[PDB]
Design a protein around this ligand. Structure first.
Ligand code: FAD
Ligand code: 8RB
Length: 448
């Protein structure tokens, strides 16, 4: 039996552990955190994620989708909140087949952990990877107390997140050609209780957005009608706009309250613990990190956030990480050797990870920001109606299809250009020749 050591019992790590273990691999998974399945008296906060077709299909292949979806809230559309007007619901797709799912992170990780162990993987918690000796094929782990433990490894999988220790170790033996692109927005998690969401009639079966240009809030629902709210706001005010809102200007919870009362007036009343949440939850950082290579020969490979940290604005980090786990397990299972598997996995996945990193950066303006855009969208709907197998909105290709991200982006670019061009020098839909635009759709977009 082939042997593998996985670092990080997160989403990609636990999924790949299950897929490999059920194929008879000897799997050892090391996780720095404690086992979340060991119930304690601690009050841990609820992070929600938007699971879409790529992640759901990865779970489906692993036989875990039904279990995960049983604990997920259906989000049928995007509810845009602009003060003064009732919330506007933009359905995400054609029917209830085209939805996204709000899942609690902890519930998903419990299901994945159980799944990896049921398949035969051994999971070792409270052990963080500190260093790797590639030459000797040994690694060093430590607990929170700092006691070190050395292990031999045959194949190392870095599923250890955005700040991957495996990536750091690899960067000492190979040039990973890393390029870090900082992101000016920090984030803060806030909570809406079930009583508050019910009192203010906040729709449970939707993803909620409070656009505000350079900053915004999003809220995802929980099974108990509570919502996790994420505030995205610049860490610092830029030199050109020193008065522009930023986390630096929000000195405490009281300042956060005044900011929400002025900028998000219909949201502030739903945030009962705003002051406490603001002061006790730390401000998180966002980034895009791109690598030229994801592996060291046949010895080690990265996947998920360890390979390609991305900005959160497309809700695709988990979806991409789970899609990577399937691809990795498939390549490892069938290749001539690990070196061939890792090179083929990297060659397949890197262009797609680059595409979603670019599309996620682009999606910020689509959420938080129009006269020319409405005519483009109006023309886009007719083209999608006339040609639904050809003209598929980019959000739908990324969210509801398994088309390689690079292809979703390429078709998205053709569509965006087509619309931008077609509307240029036209006041309305009457002056636009619909059959001419449709001919360009048939000429440039093959049916899928
Ligand atoms: C609050 C929040 C909300 C998000 N919402 C969405 C969403 O709506 N949709 C979406 O698709 N994505 C979302 N994402 C992104 C998504 O969570 C990640 O892209 C995804 O978890 C990446 O999976 P992963 O397995 O690569 O890493 P992770 O799931 O982060 O797992 C990494 C694991 O490695 C462990 N680890 C780290 N360092 C070490 C070490 N040295 N030794 C041992 N173990 C280690 C960690 O403790 C963790 O268990 C969100 C992210 C956050 C933080
Ligand atoms: C660090 C951290 C915080 C919180 C998040 C998640 C909750 O943020 C998002 C999830 C999401 O799912 N789908 C979308 C796009 C929805 C749309 O265009 O209508 C989306 C956007 C964001 Cl910011 N991710 N990481």
């Amino acid at each position: 039996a082939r042997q593998v050591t996985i670092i990080g019992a997160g989403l990609a790590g636990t999924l790949v552990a299950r897929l490999l273990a059920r194929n008879g691999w000897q799997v050892n998974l090391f996780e720095r955190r404690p086992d979340p399945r060991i119930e304690t008296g601690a009050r841990g906060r609820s992070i929600n994620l938007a699971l879409a077709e790529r992640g759901a299909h990865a779970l489906r292949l692993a036989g875990l989708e039904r279990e995960v979806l049983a604990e997920a809230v259906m989000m049928r559309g995007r509810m845009v909140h602009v003060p003064g007007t009732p919330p506007n619901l933009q359905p995400y797709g054609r029917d209830d087949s085209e939805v996204i799912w709000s899942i609690n992170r902890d519930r998903l990780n419990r299901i994945l952990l159980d799944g990896a162990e049921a398949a035969g993987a051994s999971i070792h918690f409270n052990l963080g990877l500190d260093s790797v000796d590639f030459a000797r094929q040994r690694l060093t782990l430590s607990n929170v107390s700092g006691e070190r433990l050395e292990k031999r490894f045959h194949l190392l999988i870095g599923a250890d997140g955005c700040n991957s220790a495996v990536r750091q170790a690899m960067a000492s033996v190979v040039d990973l050609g890393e390029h870090l692109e900082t992101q000016p927005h920090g984030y803060k998690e806030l909570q809406i209780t079930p009583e508050a969401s019910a009192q203010f009639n906040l729709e449970p079966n939707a993803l909620h957005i409070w656009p505000h240009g350079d900053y915004m809030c999003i809220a995802l629902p929980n099974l108990d009608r509570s919502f996790t709210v994420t505030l995205f706001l610049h860490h610092q005010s830029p030199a050109a706009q020193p008065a522009s809102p930023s986390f630096a200007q929000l000195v405490d919870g009281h300042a956060a309250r005044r900011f929400f009362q002025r900028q998000f007036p219909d949201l502030s009343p739903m945030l009962d613990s705003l002051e406490q949440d603001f002061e006790h939850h730390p401000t998180g950082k966002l980034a895009t990190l791109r690598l030229t290579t994801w592996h060291v020969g046949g010895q080690a490979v990265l996947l998920g956030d360890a390979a390609h940290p991305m900005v959160p604005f497309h809700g695709q980090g988990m979806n991409c990480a789970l899609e990577d786990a399937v691809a990795l397990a498939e390549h490892l299972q069938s290749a001539a050797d690990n070196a061939s598997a890792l090179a083929a996995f990297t060659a397949q996945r890197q262009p797609d990870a680059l595409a979603i990193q670019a599309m996620a950066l682009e999606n910020y303006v689509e959420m938080s920001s129009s006269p020319t855009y409405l005519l483009e969208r109006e023309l886009g709907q007719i083209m999608a109606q006339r040609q639904p197998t050809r003209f598929i909105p980019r959000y739908s290709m990324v969210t509801f299809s398994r088309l390689p991200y690079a292809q979703a982006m390429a078709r998205g670019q053709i569509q965006e250009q087509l619309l931008k061009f077609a509307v240029a020098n036209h006041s309305d839909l009457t002056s636009i020749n619909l059959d001419a635009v449709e001919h360009e759709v048939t000429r440039c977009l093959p049916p899928l």
